Design a protein around this ligand. Structure first.
Ligand SMILES: O=C(O)CNC(=O)C(=O)O
Ligand SMILES: [Mg+2]
Ligand code: NI
Ligand SMILES: [Zn+2]
Length: 331
């Protein structure tokens, strides 16, 4: 079995290998990359996402989210308070202000220590989940707005045509902005490109060990667990690496820098934080190997998770027994 310790693998495709996206995902899996839950892909030196980032300041963040924490430094939840709209240029200035800027630090490890020690005492503002793309239309390789759609993959694999669309999302981050422990909707893959700015640190649990994380989470968030049998779908719970280590949960960590892609694999729980002002782009995708994970994905039916239009068909076709209850949670 390849990669039996489930280490995060890093790939350096040539420009020739960068032509066929599906083929390269399958290659990475042939080397055991999925066992980690997360892989890094460094694009060939010839490639670029677009010519410059000099003209992005007028993009609107219609609903910036202030991420307010509750709990203890290593075990907390966050809720999102909606703030007034602002442009990317306004948000960048905010991120660089004395109140929100990255503190002085020695290296990524020192910054990680400061994040875990101090996150809860601050409420950073995240421009998340903004529909759109920063890939130039002329970028033909690994353009996250030009991937094969998940609806077309389900149709190719299973023969059933379904409604729905699949488009990318932009994330504008600042110091301490945080992504809670989660898997993707329907345990899909995700791909994330860090277009510009400061790094993003990721933590990930191997898919084969995801239920160990879930059991810890039920212990650490016991009211939430009674409220919902899949509460990590709410995307609000954080658990630090120190706490994970104390409880014997297998995980890995890696820092993504500007110009790098990350791929999350089906049922790979992940969480992380931004180091400073940055912009990422991400989208879900599927492969044939995903179908079995989609059929087994947990679902939130308590009403909290509320998701896209396109998840309807996935539930309806892959999980018909769950469909009625899940849809009640959507309505
Ligand atoms: O970058 C973020 O805030 C969160 N991104 C992801 O969970 C992802 O790409 O799957
Ligand atoms: Mg602009
Ligand atoms: Ni994700
Ligand atoms: Zn729920």
């Amino acid at each position: 079995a390849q990669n039996p310790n489930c280490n995060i693998m890093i790939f350096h495709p040539t420009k020739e290998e960068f032509n066929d996206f599906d083929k390269y995902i399958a290659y990475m899996e042939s080397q055991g990359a999925h066992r980690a839950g997360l892989a890094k892909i460094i694009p060939p030196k010839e490639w670029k996402a677009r010519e410059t980032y000099d003209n992005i300041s007028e993009i609107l963040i219609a609903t910036p989210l202030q991420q307010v924490a509750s709990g203890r430094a290593g075990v907390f939840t966050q809720y999102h308070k909606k703030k007034k709209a602002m442009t990317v240029g306004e948000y960048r200035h905010l991120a660089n202000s004395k109140k929100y800027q990255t503190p002085p630090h020695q290296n990524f490890e020192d910054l990680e220590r400061k994040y875990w020690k101090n996150r809860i005492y601050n409420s950073p503002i995240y421009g998340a989940d903004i529909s759109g793309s920063l890939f130039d239309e002329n970028t033909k390789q690994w353009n996250l707005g030009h991937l094969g759609t998940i609806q077309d993959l389900l149709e190719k694999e299973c023969g059933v045509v379904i409604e729905g669309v699949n488009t990318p999302y932009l994330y504008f981050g600042m110091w301490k902005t945080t992504f809670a422990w989660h898997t993707e909707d329907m345990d899909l893959y995700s791909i994330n490109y860090l277009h510009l700015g400061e790094p993003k640190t990721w933590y990930v649990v191997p898919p084969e060990h995801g239920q160990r994380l879930e059991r810890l989470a039920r212990e650490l968030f016991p009211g939430s667990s009674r409220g919902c049998g899949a509460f990590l779908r709410h995307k609000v719970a954080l658990i630090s690496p120190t706490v994970l280590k104390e409880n014997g949960i297998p995980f890995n960590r890696i820092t993504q820098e500007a110009g790098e892609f990350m791929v999350t694999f089906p049922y790979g729980y992940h969480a992380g934080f931004n180091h400073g002002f940055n912009c990422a782009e991400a989208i879900n995708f599927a492969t044939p190997r995903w179908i079995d994970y989609g059929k087994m994905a947990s679902q939130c039916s308590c009403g909290e998770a509320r998701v896209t239009f396109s998840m309807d068909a996935f539930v309806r076709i892959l999980q018909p027994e769950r469909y009625d209850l899940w849809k009640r949670g959507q309505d």
